[PDB]
Design an enzyme around this catalytic site. Sequence first.
Site, mmCIF file in Angstrom:
data_model
loop_
_atom_site.group_PDB
_atom_site.id
_atom_site.type_symbol
_atom_site.label_atom_id
_atom_site.label_comp_id
_atom_site.label_asym_id
_atom_site.label_seq_id
_atom_site.Cartn_x
_atom_site.Cartn_y
_atom_site.Cartn_z
ATOM 1 N N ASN A 94 119.948 73.355 5.763
ATOM 2 C CA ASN A 94 119.768 71.632 5.734
ATOM 3 C C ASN A 94 118.386 71.861 5.383
ATOM 4 O OD1 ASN A 94 119.117 69.567 8.182
ATOM 5 N ND2 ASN A 94 120.769 69.220 7.610
ATOM 6 N N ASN A 153 124.798 65.079 4.848
ATOM 7 C CA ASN A 153 124.755 64.157 6.840
ATOM 8 C C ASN A 153 124.701 63.045 6.843
ATOM 9 O OD1 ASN A 153 122.955 67.627 7.024
ATOM 10 N ND2 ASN A 153 125.142 67.643 7.377
#
Length: 129
Positions: free
Chosen positions: A59, A46
Amino acid sequence: KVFGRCELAAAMKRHGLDNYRGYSLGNWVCAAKFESNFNTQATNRNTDGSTDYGILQINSRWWCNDGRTPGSRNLCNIPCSALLSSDITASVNCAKKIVSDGNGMNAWVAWRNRCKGTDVQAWIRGCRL
Ligand SMILES: [Cl-]
Ligand SMILES: [Cl-]
């Protein structure tokens, strides 16, 4: 490991995801398809420097430790590499914590954009469950 659609549905059901917090099995299979194409080894970086890991693209900013996301939390208390296993247990257990967190399955961008409000039962059609 790259799962087949029904194989993954069966594994998810066994691990207690069918109707977990009100989300039917098809929601989970749909989210996995569009997050990772059913590949446990999927990773994606990301813009903020965090990375998403595994079949449900969990994440590193919040949920796991990868040793390279400064000032991040590890709410699932696991190394992110555990999420890449052929055994989906760690991913499932962490996903249960995520979906309980307040915004439900909206935490998964692909679910919100590609599964939410669609006929998700189609994802488990034909499967021996
Ligand atoms: Cl369903
Ligand atoms: Cl919800």
